[PDB]
Design a protein around this ligand. Structure first.
Ligand SMILES: [Mg+2]
Ligand SMILES: [Mg+2]
Ligand SMILES: [Mg+2]
Ligand SMILES: [Mg+2]
Ligand SMILES: [Mg+2]
Ligand SMILES: [Mg+2]
Ligand SMILES: [Mg+2]
Ligand SMILES: [Mg+2]
Ligand SMILES: [Mg+2]
Ligand SMILES: [Mg+2]
Ligand SMILES: [Mg+2]
Ligand SMILES: [Mg+2]
Ligand SMILES: [Mg+2]
Ligand SMILES: [Mg+2]
Ligand SMILES: [Mg+2]
Ligand SMILES: [Mg+2]
Ligand SMILES: [Mg+2]
Ligand SMILES: [Mg+2]
Ligand SMILES: [Mg+2]
Ligand SMILES: [Mg+2]
Ligand SMILES: [Mg+2]
Ligand SMILES: [Mg+2]
Ligand SMILES: [Mg+2]
Ligand SMILES: [Mg+2]
Ligand SMILES: [Mg+2]
Ligand SMILES: [Mg+2]
Ligand SMILES: [Mg+2]
Ligand SMILES: [Mg+2]
Ligand SMILES: [Zn+2]
Ligand SMILES: [Zn+2]
Lengths: 92, 53, 73, 111, 100
RNA sequence: ACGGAAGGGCACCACCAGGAGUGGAGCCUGCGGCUUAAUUUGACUCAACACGGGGAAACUCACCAGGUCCAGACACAAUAAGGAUUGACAGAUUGAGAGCUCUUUCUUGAUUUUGUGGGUGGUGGUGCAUGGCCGUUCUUAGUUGGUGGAGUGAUUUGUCUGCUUAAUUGCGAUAACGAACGAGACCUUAACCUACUAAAUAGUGGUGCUAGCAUUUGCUGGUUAUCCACUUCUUAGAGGGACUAUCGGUUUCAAGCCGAUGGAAGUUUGAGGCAAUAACAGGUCUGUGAUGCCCUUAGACGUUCUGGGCCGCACGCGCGCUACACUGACGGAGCCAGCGAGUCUAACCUUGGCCGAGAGGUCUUGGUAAUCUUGUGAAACUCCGUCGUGCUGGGGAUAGAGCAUUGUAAUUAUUGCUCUUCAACGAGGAAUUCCUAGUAAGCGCAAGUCAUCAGCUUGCGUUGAUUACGUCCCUGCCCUUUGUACACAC
């Protein structure tokens, strides 16, 4: 789906910073929380991420819990052009 | 377009839906839990409602 | 689900695709001189003198104040 | 600033929702229930499973992401919600663990 | 100091042992108190049809949740109040303290 | 399994003796049919028809007339920064400041677009492909191994002649013994506790201060920082209490049953909750991000927007509500409940004051609640009157006009209020429903759905009868015996 690269990088940097992301299954919400982007934008971008094995989902009462894998964190690392082992959402 | 999904949903059955199954019919709005009656029948034991009489 | 005969006019009429022109960005060409600008641009502090105003008729149309900046010079 | 009735049904549906969430993703870890203890300064969620090393992951990475998930969904402050894992005893005396083991065996294709 | 402790649970023996250890600690510190006043148990009732569809006999089902509420009024300084709210944390029982 | 076969025992979803009715009228609501662009659809004896928590203006919504959009992930191929593609003022166009599309050029710039595969969604189909849930068989007492015994075997005994019980509940009998599930036990609730713990978020008494009358002490009241005392009433928690106790009858004289006394309670104390095996090719894919398969998947059956429809009416049925009047209608006064619900990043239950005939409005106030709404000052009821056997001051349908409230929007009146209109109905044929005590019936109140809309349902309390304390005649049910040419089983 078409979306500006500004908001794509917003979704991706929030995912790389936190490691998880919730998206209440409410299209036409037009304002996600934790992120100033559309809920439809973040949901569909994450779905396109899940399809290429990077991140997994759970619906669980219309809520779309997403958590990313190691392929996801390295792909987001090279996508955002960050140093090797900069910071995951996996601190001790 | 902005007009798409323009219609107000401030009241009526289109304003509410089941928090579990997103159904519009059979809502239990008592005590602000907003579950359809079937899903309430399933989840009542772990919500904390029980049958005594 | 019997059938749909399409009693509406058979009017599959999908729009343009931002019609494919040739090369663009025509400011001016000046032989061994500095080039001026066609499409005298918008008067917003938001537009940094890079966005053309269009001119169809009776008005000029903008890109930064993206719809409403109507001047008749 | 909520009435006590709505508060108690709120924690009821909260427990039910997180139990449904945990039995959805933690099926292959022997998730056999969850318990909540709200407390001054913190609320704790004690998961009772069998494969505690699998629900923890490497250095608690899965516990960390689960805490972050429930915090993001329930709008808790970071740190006010904590999760603990627990190797449940008497695994045979747990209907859901035996049920999910049966489910996984039948999905693997056992008679 | 005029503090009030309110317990607003559903588990009656959990609430009862919480209140009993509260009052024995209070009388161990020889504190004045209005004892545990037990408010009326409020029953939250929800009556539904058993069937998901419409047919059958019109059989109804009433799921209830009893809520038990107690309150104890204390006059005791801030330090014994702080250890009182540090202690008496029971699972499934909600407590709150108000002052003045 | 069935019998218009027998024996025994049961049930107001059976009857008896009755009660209140329904069926008759008007209206509300559901169903069929008819009509329609659509009048979405499921369910058809109990076990469909005020059921889908289904009281639909829009949403709901699935149907109809039209208009958009894509939320077609991902992989591969093609176009391609001399640009893939997106968006847009105004005008035409359109119900429509939907660029939807067209004119005109602007804008953006690898996210895309086109094709292929492959997905995704679907209140689309299949409840006869399913899971789960529910209902029913079936509110009755029934069901099953182990080891023995009988029989070639299917199978049977155990699980039974009698007597008893609400009950394969027990006494007993006995090729059976010992068990299990169900019933019961259990749990909740309603009744009792002047015995325990307590309590300005429940009360009571006294003390102060204070109002009125009598005054002679008194009677009736008010009073939050006037305190003091208590827990009878109120709330709870922990317990106790009834086990058919005692007595008298009756029974092989055992299980038990009947009567009386005592007792708050002597129909397993009352009412429920839970409730076995085996099944129905019961219902539900329209509760489910529960689902296999099939269909569709981009001028889509996805989704959303506008407007209709689900209410449409020659008719036929089912739940009900109003009544057909003096055991009454109306007008004044008198005046008593219980179950419950209620606002936070919202605008809920509203007191009180004022305005308004009214509905309602406005200014404030309390309450996240045993504290405030709320003593929910409910209605039926009672006492005084008016009326007067007249379809009448019964009855209040059908209409016209106006005033308000909810909502974006009320036109096929959302409801409420005012005035006017003032119809059938004179107690209901064949038929047929429910019911044995605080039960029927009458009476209203709260909650559910809910922005607004109860004639519905779920509960609550208020007033409170008659008639049985039985039978198997009808309708069925359980067990035994018997007959069968039945086995999808009369
Ligand atoms: Mg009888
Ligand atoms: Mg009779
Ligand atoms: Mg009648
Ligand atoms: Mg029956
Ligand atoms: Mg519509
Ligand atoms: Mg509609
Ligand atoms: Mg659809
Ligand atoms: Mg079936
Ligand atoms: Mg089924
Ligand atoms: Mg044998
Ligand atoms: Mg033999
Ligand atoms: Mg045998
Ligand atoms: Mg006084
Ligand atoms: Mg005797
Ligand atoms: Mg009983
Ligand atoms: Mg189903
Ligand atoms: Mg209808
Ligand atoms: Mg009915
Ligand atoms: Mg009167
Ligand atoms: Mg009262
Ligand atoms: Mg009259
Ligand atoms: Mg009958
Ligand atoms: Mg209502
Ligand atoms: Mg309506
Ligand atoms: Mg209804
Ligand atoms: Mg014969
Ligand atoms: Mg045959
Ligand atoms: Mg015949
Ligand atoms: Zn639901
Ligand atoms: Zn500008």
């Amino acid at each position: 789906m078409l979306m500006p690269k500004e908001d794509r990088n917003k979704i991706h940097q929030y995912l790389f910073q936190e490691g998880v992301v919730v998206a209440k299954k409410d299209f036409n919400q037009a304002k996600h929380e934790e992120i100033d982007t559309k809920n439809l934008y973040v949901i569909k971008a994450l779905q396109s991420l899940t399809s290429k094995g990077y991140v997994k989902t759970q619906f669980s009462w219309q809520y779309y819990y997403y958590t990313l894998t190691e392929e996801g964190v390295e792909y987001l690392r090279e996508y955002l052009n960050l140093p090797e082992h900069i910071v995951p959402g996996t601190y001790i | 377009e902005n007009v798409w999904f323009s219609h107000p949903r401030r009241y009526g059955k289109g304003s509410r839906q089941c928090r579990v199954c997103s159904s519009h019919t059979g809502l239990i709005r008592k005590y602000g839990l907003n579950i359809c009656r079937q899903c309430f029948r399933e989840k009542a034991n772990d919500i904390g409602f029980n049958k005594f009489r | 689900r019997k059938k749909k005969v399409y009693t509406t006019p058979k009017k599959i009429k999908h729009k343009h695709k931002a019609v494919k022109l040739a090369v663009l960005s025509y400011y001016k060409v000046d032989a061994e001189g500095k080039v001026t600008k066609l499409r005298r641009e918008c008067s917003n502090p938001t537009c940094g003198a890079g966005v053309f105003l269009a001119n169809h008729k009776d008005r000029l149309y903008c890109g930064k104040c993206h719809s409403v900046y109507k001047v008749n010079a | 600033l909520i009435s006590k009735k709505r508060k108690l049904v709120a924690d009821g549906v909260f427990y039910a929702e997180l139990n449904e969430f945990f039995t959805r993703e933690l099926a292959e870890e022997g998730y056999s229930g969850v318990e909540v203890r709200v407390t001054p300064t913190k609320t704790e969620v004690i998961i009772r499973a069998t494969r505690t090393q699998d629900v923890l992951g490497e250095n608690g990475r899965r516990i960390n992401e689960l805490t972050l998930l429930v915090q993001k969904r329930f709008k808790y402050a970071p740190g006010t919600i904590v999760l603990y894992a627990e190797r449940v005893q008497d695994r045979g005396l747990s209907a859901v663990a035996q049920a999910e083991s049966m489910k996984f065996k039948l999905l693997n294709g056992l008679a | 100091i005029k503090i009030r402790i309110t317990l607003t649970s559903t588990k009656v023996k959990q609430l009862e042992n919480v209140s009993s250890n509260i009052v024995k600690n209070a009388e161990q510190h020889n504190l004045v108190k209005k004892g545990p006043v037990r408010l009326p148990t409020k029953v939250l009732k929800i009556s539904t049809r058993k069937t998901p569809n419409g047919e059958g006999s019109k059989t109804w089902e009433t799921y209830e949740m009893r809520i038990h509420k107690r309150y104890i009024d204390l006059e005791a300084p801030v330090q014994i109040v702080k250890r009182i709210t540090q202690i008496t944390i029971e699972p499934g029982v909600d407590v709150e303290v108000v002052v003045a």
